Amino acid sequence: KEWIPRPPEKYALSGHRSPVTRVIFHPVFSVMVSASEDATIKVWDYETGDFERTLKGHTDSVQDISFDHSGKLLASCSADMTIKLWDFQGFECIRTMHGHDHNVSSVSIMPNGDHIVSASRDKTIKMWEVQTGYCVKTFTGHREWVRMVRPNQDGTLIASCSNDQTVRVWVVATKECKAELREHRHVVECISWAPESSYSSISEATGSEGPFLLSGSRDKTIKMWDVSTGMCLMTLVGHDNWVRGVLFHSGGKFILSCADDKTLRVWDYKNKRCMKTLNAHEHFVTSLDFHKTAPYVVTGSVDQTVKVWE
Amino acid sequence: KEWIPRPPEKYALSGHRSPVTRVIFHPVFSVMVSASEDATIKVWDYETGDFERTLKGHTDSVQDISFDHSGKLLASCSADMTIKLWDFQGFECIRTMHGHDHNVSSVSIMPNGDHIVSASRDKTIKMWEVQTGYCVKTFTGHREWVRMVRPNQDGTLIASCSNDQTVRVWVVATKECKAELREHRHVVECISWAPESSYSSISEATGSEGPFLLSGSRDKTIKMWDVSTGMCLMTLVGHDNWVRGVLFHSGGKFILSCADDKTLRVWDYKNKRCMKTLNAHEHFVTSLDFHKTAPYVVTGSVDQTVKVWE
Amino acid sequence: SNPAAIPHAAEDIQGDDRWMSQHNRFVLDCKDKEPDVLFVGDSMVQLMQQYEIWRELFSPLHALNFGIGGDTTRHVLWRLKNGELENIKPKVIVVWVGTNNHENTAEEVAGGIEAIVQLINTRQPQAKIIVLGLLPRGEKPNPLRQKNAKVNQLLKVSLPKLANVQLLDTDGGFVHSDGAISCHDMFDFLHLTGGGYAKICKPLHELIMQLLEETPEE
Amino acid sequence: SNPAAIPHAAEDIQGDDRWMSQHNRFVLDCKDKEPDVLFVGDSMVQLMQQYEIWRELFSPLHALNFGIGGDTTRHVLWRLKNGELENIKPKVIVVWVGTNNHENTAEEVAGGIEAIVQLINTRQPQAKIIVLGLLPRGEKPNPLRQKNAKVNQLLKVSLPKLANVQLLDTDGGFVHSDGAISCHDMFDFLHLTGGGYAKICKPLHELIMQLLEETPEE
């Protein structure tokens, strides 16, 4: 079931009043969501493109978005230091979660839709109970700004990302940390975990007689890794500016990438090559997402558009 | 000995500080001259492109330029109401001729290099003695600005062009006028006479049992006229703004033009079709010139540049 | 006798005589150019030329731009009075002034514009005139957004009298619901950005072209 | 005690409180952005952003622009002192102020800039500073062409003391032989055109790029 990552943009959705921060596909409906410094969450229709709805109620900026498994709850993040939980019965905000002392630049609903993880300039990662809005666990760690947090498909683990040029993988239960991944030259802005394609070993499978993650930095470098050994295994030696998004394709043929080099990259870690490039925007591409099921990619930047690709 | 009118510009000469007004080829040397609102006449090298010399001494703007046969005298025109006569021993001005009471917008040396013709907002056409600077005849005629004058291969006749939307052909000796060519819809900006190509008849040569000229206008349309009858013959309906320049190719295969639609067009009056189109400049194109012998045309425009096309 | 409508040249207080330099350039332009379209007014007019949209829309229309920054009705008047209206016979004239007339009640300012219109169709009876309405300004609501609004009000009523004039009161989404002006549209909450002009010029160009397509034997 | 170097917020006399609006916008920008390059100064700096050449050269540099039109040394100071220098840690700062400082002698003006620079390398010791020299102005020669020139002079002398600063005194051919400035370079004989800035920015960019390539672990 091979896939097409390319052409010229087949829908460009304008509407936000300010840079777009994150783009997100809904797990079920033919709809996709976008966040901005607006500070607004907006909802399109990627099949058709329609201003569907706007979600208002943050004070300063919307930095991250994350849907629960069911596609019925949406968490958001802001420079208000809040973490709003939204109901996709369509409208209302449910809870507002207060803890972080500064900018909150990443959030995620964990798989057992019972917890939320966030990360902040706090230098903090916090864990909130969805149905009580309580802060439950706080991960003290890096010496600087934390930029991203990601769960592990299994829910067991957490990957964090920060200004101290470091990637940490934490144990969600014990709050110990199995690994600190060090060999980045500048701030790391990105993390993705590898899925149904741990076949990728092929490209580096020797040693003698595991779990993986990509990191995009302001090196303009995406680094592959395994947590287990602490070695990075790759470095996608790349295009021209701060890297901003990383994304293993539906399977594991390709890695997708976007950055401040006003561009979206599809790599071939099928032996290091970078198999295609598209100039997607007229200012930094801020983020992307690939659909796990359907032939569409979204992409949002600072020229305040959301672009849809086939 | 067919010819190539086209490519992408193979020399772009910057240097003037203001719109270029006329471009001209020297009859002998590998050199070409340009006038501007500068108010300066400058000299390149079309083979190489080199700021060779600058000719200064007008007050306000240089609107036309005209070499004598031998390429040793050059007349110029300006909004000072002057007509400087210059020596191509290389530098000095020789005479300054005073008469017109307003802008002088074209000049030409006649074939028997012993007189000059000029035209003005005067509503006037004046004939100057080259070697005494005297004004000798003045042709009163149109009720508005006179935009251009050209002699007749022979020297015997004069083609005028004006804001009364008219083209006049005058007898240089009697000062009578054989023709008033009426059927332009808006100001006429251009005239050229037809050369070694009176074969052109072909396209319109019936009737039952002559000299020819073209007018270029703010019509956006170029006409062809046969004067002895004074009928319009063709009407090449082409591009998109005022027509500023109008030529017959050395043969008579084609007709070249240029206009306020950043453009230079080659016309195949064999079948009224406009056989090619070069977007030549990024702001209006003021004047062009073909080279009776070797393969070049030059093009000057409001973007302050002179271009040499092979 | 209303002050906003008495012509008066801007005295140079700085030393480089820049105001009169520009005015002369215009009169010089008036002497030997011949446009179809003529833009007169303040910084709104003058800045328009600096953006790519000018060379894309109005440049091929054979248009001249007589704008000076910070000019008021009184100055624009004087400039027109002393020779920016001679020799040329534009088919369309765009007037855009007023937002710099602090010191004048909106009523006065309306009078000013009207005075300018009057002058133009005296010296230029064949010209069809477009008056751009005054735009909002300031990040958040204020007495000035109110003032310009009134000017526009009064003009809507007063200009359909008077020969060959219409007001073009554009509104692009300059104010949103919360009543703020994005600096992506006004980079200093007064002057337009490239984007901003586009919201203004699309409709303006569209109208001019109409008005030009009306009659072409000049 | 030199007046040009006493910090001082510009009182809004118009009504729309635009100066403070902009300052706030910057403070706000200082709270959560994180640039490599910071441009501070007056209209010369502000206007630069409006042209195609900014998205072409400095946008990819992660650059902020804290320019306000008509600001003087006194104003820029106050601005910098009141929080336009917090939280951010730019690698390079470009200062361009002074030409709006009528009311001060050349000498005083140089003092102003110098004070600005002093402040900058106090609050931002890591930052390498470029000071763009004052540009000529006015159609034909005048007192102010002279003033600005002196400022440049004194700066060439007094800036190679003081840590991490250099003057970049660009000169594109803004004045010709006849001593005239073409309105194709300065549309109002003060503010630059697209063309103009290209003459300034080429070398400026070239320099910054140098300075950035110097040290990258922030």
The token pair that represents B32 in the structure block: 């070409």
The type of residue at A193 is W
The token pair that represents B303 in the structure block: 């973007």
Element (H, E) at D40: strand D37-41
Q: Quote the CA–CA distance of D86 and D27 in Å, as a whole number.
A: 8
Helical H segments across C33-165, by residue range: 43-48, 52-57, 73-81, 106-123, 143-158
Of D52, D143, D189, the CB nearest to C18: D189
Which chain D residues are Cβ-neighbours of C68 within 8 angstroms? Answer: 188
The token pair that represents A4 in the structure block: 């097409």
Say whether the B–A interface has 3 or more Cβ pairs within 8 Å.
Answer: no
User: Could you check whether the bond before residue B39 is cis, i.e. omega within 30 degrees of 0?
Assistant: yes
- Name A167's Cβ contacts closer than 8 Å, sequence gap at least 6: A159, A160, A161, A179, A180, A181, A184, A188, A191, A213, A215, A225
Report the greatest alpha carbon distance in chain D.
Answer: 50
Count of structural domains within chain B: 1
Residues of D tagged active-site: 43, 188, 191
The token pair that represents A286 in the structure block: 């801020």
Nearest to B67 by CA among B101, B98, B41, B48: B41
A106 within a domain of the structure (yes/no): yes
Q: Quote the CA–CA distance of C34 and B191 in Å, as a whole number.
A: 20
- Inter-chain CB proximity A79 and D55 less than 8 Å: no
Spatial contact of C164 and C93, defined as CB atoms under 8 Å apart:
no
- Inter-chain CB proximity A18 and C184 less than 8 Å: yes
A99 within a domain of the structure (yes/no): yes
Exposed / middle / buried, residue B132 (Cβ in 10 Å: 0-12, 13-18, 19+): exposed
Q: Which residue of D has its CA nearest to A105?
A: D32
Nearest to C166 by CA among C122, C202, C208: C208
The alpha-carbon radius of gyration of chain D (Å, integer) is 16
Q: Quote the CA–CA distance of B287 and B254 in Å, as a whole number.
A: 17
Domain that holds residue B227: 10-310
- Inter-chain CB proximity B283 and C62 less than 8 Å: no
Distances in whole angstroms, Cα of residue B32 to Cα of each of A54, B35, B48, B66, B247: 65, 11, 11, 11, 17
> With helix as H, strand as E and coil as C, how does chain A read?
CCCCCCCCCCEEEECCCCCEEEEEECCCCCEEEEEECCCCEEEEECCCCCCCEEECCCCCCEEEEEECCCCCEEEEEECCCECCEEECCCCCEEECCECCCCCEEEEEECCCCCEEEEEECCCEEEEEECCCCCEEEEEECCCCCEEEEEECCCCCEEEEEECCCCEEEEECCCCCEEEEECCCCCCECCCEECCCCHHHHHHHCCCCCCCEEEEEECCCEEECEECCCCCECCCEECCCCCEEEEEECCCCCCEEEEECCCEEEEECCCCCCCCEEEECCCCCEEEEEECCCCCCEEEEECCCEEEEEC
- Inter-chain CB proximity D190 and C18 less than 8 Å: yes
Q: Which residue of C has its CA nearest to D140?
A: C16
Q: Quote the CA–CA distance of A166 and A170 in Å, as a whole number.
A: 13
Place of tokens 């009580």: A132
| CATH of residue A72 | 2.130.10.10
Of D59, D217, D218, the CB nearest to A283: D59
Exposed / middle / buried, residue A143 (Cβ in 10 Å: 0-12, 13-18, 19+): exposed
How many CB pairs below 8 Å do chains A and D form together? 18
A284 within a domain of the structure (yes/no): yes
Which chain C residues are Cβ-neighbours of D193 within 8 angstroms? Answer: 50
Nearest to C162 by CA among C203, C213, C121: C121
> What is the DSSP track for B3-33?
----SS-S-EEE--SS-EEEEEE-SSSSEEE
Find the catalytic residue in C62, C158, C182, C191.
Answer: C191
* Half-sphere exposure (Cβ direction) of B201: Cα atoms closer than 13 Å: 9
Q: Quote the CA–CA distance of A234 and B149 in Å, as a whole number.
A: 75
D139 CA to centre of own chain: 22
Distances in whole angstroms, Cα of residue C104 to Cα of each of B31, B128, C12, C98, C101: 61, 59, 21, 10, 6
Which chain A residues are Cβ-neighbours of D216 within 8 angstroms? Answer: 185-186
A169 within a domain of the structure (yes/no): yes
Q: Quote the CA–CA distance of D22 and D8 in Å, as a whole number.
A: 16
Q: Quote the CA–CA distance of C75 and B271 in Å, as a whole number.
A: 57
β-strand partners of A247? A256
- Name D149's Cβ contacts closer than 8 Å, sequence gap at least 6: D134, D136
Q: Which residue of B has its CA nearest to C32?
A: B103
Spatial contact of B93 and B77, defined as CB atoms under 8 Å apart:
no
Backbone angles phi, psi at D205, to 5 degrees: -55, -55
Does residue C52 sit at the A interface (CB-CB below 8 Å)? no
Alpha carbon of A285: minimum distance to chain C alpha carbons (Å): 18
> What is the DSSP track for B207-240?
S----EEEEEETTSEEEEEETTTTEEEEEEE--S
What own/partner pairs with CB < 8 Å and gap ≥ 24 does A76-83 have? A76/A35, A76/A41, A76/A107, A77/A35, A77/A104, A77/A105, A77/A106, A77/A107, A77/A118, A78/A39, A78/A104, A79/A39, A79/A103, A79/A104, A79/D32, A80/A39, A80/A104, A81/A120, A82/A58, A83/A107, A83/A116, A83/A118, A83/A128
Nearest to A260 by CA among B39, C135, D62: D62
B101 within a domain of the structure (yes/no): yes
B287: helix, strand or coil = strand
Dihedral Cα A43, A45, A46, A47, nearest 10 deg: 180
Of D22, D188, D194, the CB nearest to C18: D188
Q: Quote the CA–CA distance of B3 and B206 in Å, as a whole number.
A: 29
Of C102, C190, C194, the CB nearest to D50: C194
Q: Do the bridges between strand B93-95 and strand A285-290 make them parallel or antiparallel, or are there none, so unpaired?
A: unpaired
Does residue D105 sit at the C interface (CB-CB below 8 Å)? no
Q: Which residue of C has its CA nearest to A18?
A: C184
Spatial contact of C165 and C157, defined as CB atoms under 8 Å apart:
no
| Residue to test with chain C: of B147, B162, B218, most C Cβ within 10 A | B218
Element (H, E) at D152: helix D143-158
Alpha carbon of A184: minimum distance to chain D alpha carbons (Å): 11
- Hey, which chains touch D, using 3+ CB pairs under 8 Å? A, B, C
β-strand partners of A5? none
Tell me, yes or no, if C188 is annotated catalytic: yes
| Domains with residue ranges and CATH for chain C | 1-218 (3.40.50.1110)
Q: Quote the CA–CA distance of B180 and B139 in Å, as a whole number.
A: 14
Place of tokens 């008021």: C72
Q: Quote the CA–CA distance of A203 and B74 in Å, as a whole number.
A: 76
The token pair that represents A28 in the structure block: 């079920």
Q: What method did the depositors use to determine the structure? A: X-ray
B30 within a domain of the structure (yes/no): yes
Say whether the C–B interface has 3 or more Cβ pairs within 8 Å.
Answer: yes
B1 within a domain of the structure (yes/no): no
Q: Quote the CA–CA distance of B225 and B213 in Å, as a whole number.
A: 5
Of C21, C46, C68, the CB nearest to D139: C21
Spatial contact of C68 and C46, defined as CB atoms under 8 Å apart:
yes
Other beta carbons within 10 Å of A266: 20
A293 within a domain of the structure (yes/no): yes
The token pair that represents B264 in the structure block: 């230079």
Alpha carbon of D187: minimum distance to chain B alpha carbons (Å): 14
Question: What is the structure's resolution, reported in angstroms to one decimal?
Answer: 3.4
Strand order in the sheet with B62-67: B62-67, B73-78, B85-87, B93-95
Q: Which residue of B has its CA nearest to D174?
A: B17
D24: helix, strand or coil = helix
Which chain B residues are Cβ-neighbours of C218 within 8 angstroms? Answer: 186
The token pair that represents A247 in the structure block: 């994304």
The token pair that represents C7 in the structure block: 């012509």
Q: Do the bridges between strand C63-67 and strand A73-78 make them parallel or antiparallel, or are there none, so unpaired?
A: unpaired
Element (H, E) at D187: none
Find the catalytic residue in C43, C71, C75, C185.
Answer: C43
